[PDB]
Design an enzyme around this catalytic site. Sequence first.
Site, PDB file in Angstrom:
ATOM      1  N   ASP A 134      -0.958  17.190  -9.283  1.00 22.52           N
ATOM      2  CA  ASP A 134       0.238  16.284  -9.157  1.00 22.52           C
ATOM      3  C   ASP A 134       0.779  15.726  -8.065  1.00 22.52           C
ATOM      4  OD1 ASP A 134       2.523  15.653 -10.543  1.00 22.52           O
ATOM      5  OD2 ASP A 134       4.014  17.657 -10.771  1.00 22.52           O
ATOM      6  N   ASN A 160       6.122  15.179  -3.976  1.00 24.03           N
ATOM      7  CA  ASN A 160       5.328  16.821  -3.984  1.00 24.03           C
ATOM      8  C   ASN A 160       4.752  17.656  -2.736  1.00 24.03           C
ATOM      9  OD1 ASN A 160       6.032  17.538  -6.711  1.00 24.03           O
ATOM     10  ND2 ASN A 160       4.353  17.134  -7.791  1.00 24.03           N
TER      11      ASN A 160
END
Lengths: 8, 285
Positions: free
Chosen positions: B140, B145
Amino acid sequence: WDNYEFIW
Amino acid sequence: QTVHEFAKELDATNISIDKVVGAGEFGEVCSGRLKLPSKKEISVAIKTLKVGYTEKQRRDFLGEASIMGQFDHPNIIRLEGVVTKSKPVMIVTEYMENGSLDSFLRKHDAQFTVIQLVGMLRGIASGMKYLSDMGYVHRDLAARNILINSNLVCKVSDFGLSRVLEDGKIPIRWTSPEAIAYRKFTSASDVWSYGIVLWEVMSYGERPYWEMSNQDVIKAVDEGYRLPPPMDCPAALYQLMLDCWQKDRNNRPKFEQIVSILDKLIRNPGSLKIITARPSNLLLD
């Protein structure tokens, strides 16, 4: 979000 | 339960919640303070598990903490501990004043120096080098993030999709072609994602592939099309993107090599002075 999706 | 292998159980009397600063998958995110055993007080992010949670939600919530707690590195978000013996169940991590990197950069379009951006990118690469050394594929890796602190240090977060390299919905725009095609996830697929993050950073948080259909992102990339150079992007950095985006995963750089490349740019800032009409928005090759 439209950031995560399956493949259709 | 399983999380205590890699997470300290905190005494809730040592946690002060200051404010709800957001909403997560599993409940609210707060900021606050943690009093350490030495009686030092630090700022922390405090994630709470929603009242009336399911057993599944608890396992998923704490499981991400279990992964994070395996890593002790300056560019991976630090787990201070968890609270499980009282409710709400909590995950306490280091505080990152400037939040998610993509949102932060969108607020500051064209306001940082290339060397500052390269510093951010080197920290991301250094954390990923360690994660990959530890046998994890993130799956991810994206600017949303990465979290960024008051001193612009960037740290890998969000281990929800992460797993050990061993024999549902995917972040399509960040995922390598082979991982889309047949779920071939490797550290080299994380290197692909890193190339996308590199583009996001140099683009000050533009969305990769803008609002292209998912189907067209997949087809275009498979055909050899790549995101174009960000405005005023150093040649060296665009080349690094292209190398991260090699069709053949064996031809992509390792994270160690990426760190080395960025370190050379930081050490020879004049390098960055060389800077980048086509028939399409994406560039073929």
